């Protein structure tokens, strides 16, 4: 056993969404071993927060039309799925949005909770055309992982059935795109030994370094069973 462990070298954060992470030195073949196994956990298993429920006033269903609003309610729900939200303390927060007058309703119009950060405040949700028009809604953000559709969520719970509650497809996973590469390491005299560049392209909330840390933790927790129980 010539155990040679890699170490986190450099995190080239080009943007808050897109960041490269270089990794060296890796012994031959471990570059692709961790590369893919991590990519899989980073795609599907990464916990995140996502808009689960919405409840707009003057709205009985998502297919209706609201006066003084360019977008149909479905297109508003779409914008709320891609609303970047980070809940710090609790798993479930129900934010309130009341806004009026002529203006594109941005994410900053939502009343921020003590422990809730709206990561992109300039994110568009709805367009108010008429000055007389006012919009009011209650946006529930819950935490989960992966992607939970509204068609899978309308066939499980349904204990309380309040008429006026629109469910939304949850985009819980924060990682949008991920693709690991391999480059020259140029260490001491290892030569063969190289590195592993993990390029991540995420939303706002989950931080590149933090996310890779969590993904390696999930893989190590699955490996407990193969180390401990034989």
């Amino acid at each position: 056993t010539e155990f040679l462990k890699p170490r986190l070298v450099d995190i080239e954060q080009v943007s808050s969404t897109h960041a490269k992470v270089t990794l060296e030195p890796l012994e031959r073949g471990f570059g692709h071993t961790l590369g893919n196994a991590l990519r899989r956990i980073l795609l599907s298993s990464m916990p995140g927060c996502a808009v689960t429920e919405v409840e707009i006033d003057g709205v009985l269903h998502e297919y209706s039309t609201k006066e003084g609003v360019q977008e149909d309610i479905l297109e508003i729900l779409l914008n709320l799925k891609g609303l970047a939200v980070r809940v710090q303390g609790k798993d479930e927060v129900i934010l309130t949005l009341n806004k009026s007058g002529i203006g594109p309703v941005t994410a900053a119009d939502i009343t921020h909770d003590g422990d809730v950060e709206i990561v992109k405040p300039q994110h568009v949700i709805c367009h108010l055309t008429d000055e007389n028009a006012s919009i009011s809604m209650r946006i529930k953000v819950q935490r989960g992982r992966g992607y939970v559709p509204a068609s899978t969520r309308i066939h499980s719970e349904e204990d309380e059935r309040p008429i006026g509650r629109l469910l939304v497809d949850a985009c819980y996973s924060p990682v949008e795109r991920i693709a690991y590469n391999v480059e020259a390491a140029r260490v001491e005299q290892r030569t063969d030994l190289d590195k592993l560049v993990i390029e991540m392209e995420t939303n706002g909330t989950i931080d590149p370094e933090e996310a890779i840390r969590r993904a390696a933790t999930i893989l190590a927790e699955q490996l407990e069973a193969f180390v401990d129980l034989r």
Binding site: R177, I178, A179, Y180, N181, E199
Partner: peptide, 8 residues
């Protein structure tokens, strides 16, 4: 799913 070198 299959993905190109770019990662998409």
């Amino acid at each position: 799913m299959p993905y190109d070198e770019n990662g998409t």
